[PDB]
Design an enzyme around this catalytic site. Structure first.
Site, PDB file in Angstrom:
ATOM      1  CG  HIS A 250      -2.153   0.779   1.101  1.00  0.00           C
ATOM      2  ND1 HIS A 250      -3.198   0.691   1.998  1.00  0.00           N
ATOM      3  CD2 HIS A 250      -2.536   1.681   0.164  1.00  0.00           C
ATOM      4  CE1 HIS A 250      -4.170   1.503   1.619  1.00  0.00           C
ATOM      5  NE2 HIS A 250      -3.794   2.115   0.510  1.00  0.00           N
TER       6      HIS A 250
ATOM      7  CG  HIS B 138      -0.958   3.720   3.834  1.00  0.00           C
ATOM      8  ND1 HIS B 138      -1.673   2.811   4.586  1.00  0.00           N
ATOM      9  CD2 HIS B 138      -1.871   4.416   3.116  1.00  0.00           C
ATOM     10  CE1 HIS B 138      -2.961   2.952   4.334  1.00  0.00           C
ATOM     11  NE2 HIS B 138      -3.109   3.920   3.446  1.00  0.00           N
TER      12      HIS B 138
ATOM     13  CG  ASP C  21       2.579   3.152   7.711  1.00  0.00           C
ATOM     14  OD1 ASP C  21       2.067   3.386   6.593  1.00  0.00           O
ATOM     15  OD2 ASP C  21       2.006   2.473   8.594  1.00  0.00           O
ATOM     16  CG  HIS C  22       2.964   0.390   4.240  1.00  0.00           C
ATOM     17  ND1 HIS C  22       2.420  -0.871   4.128  1.00  0.00           N
ATOM     18  CD2 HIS C  22       2.363   0.965   5.308  1.00  0.00           C
ATOM     19  CE1 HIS C  22       1.531  -1.053   5.087  1.00  0.00           C
ATOM     20  NE2 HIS C  22       1.477   0.045   5.817  1.00  0.00           N
TER      21      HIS C  22
ATOM     22  CG  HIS D  46     -15.054  -5.014  -1.641  1.00  0.00           C
ATOM     23  ND1 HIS D  46     -14.541  -5.579  -0.492  1.00  0.00           N
ATOM     24  CD2 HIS D  46     -16.054  -5.833  -2.048  1.00  0.00           C
ATOM     25  CE1 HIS D  46     -15.202  -6.690  -0.216  1.00  0.00           C
ATOM     26  NE2 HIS D  46     -16.125  -6.867  -1.145  1.00  0.00           N
TER      27      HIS D  46
ATOM     28  CG  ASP E 258      -6.699  -3.088   4.530  1.00  0.00           C
ATOM     29  OD1 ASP E 258      -6.473  -1.857   4.572  1.00  0.00           O
ATOM     30  OD2 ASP E 258      -7.767  -3.600   4.936  1.00  0.00           O
TER      31      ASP E 258
ATOM     32  CG  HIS F   5       0.239  -2.072  10.254  1.00  0.00           C
ATOM     33  ND1 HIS F   5      -0.944  -1.497  10.665  1.00  0.00           N
ATOM     34  CD2 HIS F   5       0.849  -1.153   9.467  1.00  0.00           C
ATOM     35  CE1 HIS F   5      -1.044  -0.283  10.151  1.00  0.00           C
ATOM     36  NE2 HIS F   5       0.031  -0.050   9.421  1.00  0.00           N
TER      37      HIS F   5
END
Ligand SMILES: [Zn+2]
Ligand SMILES: [Zn+2]
Lengths: 297, 269
Positions: free
Chosen positions: A63, A65, A67-68, A140, A211, A259
């Site tokens: 993802h 983000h 922090d990733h 989704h 996620d 996480h």
């Protein structure tokens, strides 16, 4: 094959947990390490391990983000500074190309190795004769991806001592035997290669969720995997319980929760683990530098 | 006014020293902290200090090399994550805007505070009734700047003796520069890189850096009161760093080799 958690926190760094990054060590399998996500300071965590930037072959981002990914520019740069020359490929959601190319460009970085960047889509994102990695849109309407690293069944290894003991010295003939070919030895004997191969090794598999939410897509993605690595919390209970139910239904062999936000400290973490354990016994609340072995069979 | 060294290492992170970042703590003067350069993990280093992201008012970038800027996205992000609402200004060479904006856009980061980005040029970069900050071009290949932070002089208070403004000079990355020593004339404290030892004039030249002796000589000729060496290559840590220090001490007695978390007070002379 092992998983070495470099960062298990969420949102922002904490003295106890750095932002996310997990190393899938494949030294025996490919003489390399693959990273799943790369939060800021991931290379710093690595300084406390035997893992060096040069050994990293691939980095998969789940993802976009901060922090990733904020640890990517630095890691790519250090690998170059250290003289790594092997190709490295980064896989990630749309935007990973721009993030990386712009960072390297403004810092005037000239990589000492080939760098491939793949903005992935659901489906097979990498495959060779040893591994096949598939990416799936987990939630989704989310621009996040879960990944399944599937080691392919390994052809049975050659029973070389037996061959030598039969006075069949190493050489070209070993390759033919390995392929299951019938061979004519120098002294006239006829040997059937298949009689000298051990049974095939069943491939292992590790799944990385990407996620905190779960879905049937996650369940199927992780079906029968050896280890399911899932994000337990949002950086901001039932989440963990659902992860555990998913692992149970998917028949994963082990569930590792990562996480974890600052909200969970010391005993809180163990409570998180307990939530999962109550549904799926073989569950783990990861912590920085935890290492999990992934044995065959 | 104090200097808090968050990262003192050169090129890449090492267990001993993290990449570059120096905090100019102005809690008493402005109730904030200013940062000079921001390498990766600067925010992580800060977790071991009393300095919080929200207290950072301004960040000055000497040049675009990764070991001086990769910590920006994270730091800006955390400051927002934590609810900071005060304006933050980032100053740096051309390209600084693209770096930050791209980083925030690709992660869909929406800051909770206003962010101003100033792509600088040689000369005065910031000035208010209390401070005058000037930048000068240094010698580092890529576009690079050195900075001088000049606290203005003030009249005594209801009378008290006048107050002479303190000054701190940052060399950033660079080969020995005249423009630097000239800009650093009579400064209170000079923070200069010393990537290489005295006898490594050649390596220093090739990688656009300075030696311990070169830094010491700059401080001496500029009439600085104190010299702090930083941006030390991982080749000199522990007591070996003391050797580097001594090289400087020999030319400029008041010289000190910085190290992670070293805090140096800047007294009103
Ligand atoms: Zn530097
Ligand atoms: Zn530099």
């Amino acid at each position: 094959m092992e998983l070495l958690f470099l960062g298990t926190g969420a949102g922002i760094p904490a003295k106890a947990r750095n932002v996310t990054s997990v190393a899938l060590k494949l030294l025996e399998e490919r003489r390399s390490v693959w990273l799943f996500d790369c939060g800021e300071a991931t290379q710093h965590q690595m300084l406390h391990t035997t893992i060096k930037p040069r050994k990293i072959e691939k980095i998969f981002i789940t993802h976009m983000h901060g922090d990733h990914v904020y640890g990517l520019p630095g890691l790519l740069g250090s690998r170059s500074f250290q003289g790594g020359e092997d190709e490295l490929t980064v896989y990630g959601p749309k935007g990973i190309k721009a993030f990386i190319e712009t960072s390297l460009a403004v810092t005037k970085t000239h990589l000492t190795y080939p760098l491939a960047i793949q903005e992935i889509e659901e489906g097979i994102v990498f495959e060779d004769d040893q591994f096949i990695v598939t990416a799936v849109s987990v939630i989704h309407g989310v621009e996040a991806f879960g990944y399944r690293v599937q080691e392919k069944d390994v052809p049975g290894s050659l029973k070389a001592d037996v061959l030598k003991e039969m006075n069949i010295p190493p050489g070209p003939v070993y390759q033919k035997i390995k392929k299951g070919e019938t061979v004519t030895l120098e002294d006239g004997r006829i040997i059937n290669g298949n009689d000298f191969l051990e049974p095939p090794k069943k491939g292992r598999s590790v799944v990385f969720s990407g996620d905190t939410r779960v879905s049937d897509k996650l369940k199927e993605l992780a079906r029968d995997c050896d280890v399911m690595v899932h994000e337990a919390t949002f950086a901001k209970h039932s989440t963990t319980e659902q992860a555990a139910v998913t692992a149970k239904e998917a028949r994963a062999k082990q569930l590792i929760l990562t996480h974890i936000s600052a909200r969970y400290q010391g005993d809180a973490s163990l409570e998180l683990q307990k939530e999962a354990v109550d549904v799926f016994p073989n569950s783990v609340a990861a912590y920085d530098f935890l290492e999990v072995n992934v044995p065959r069979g």
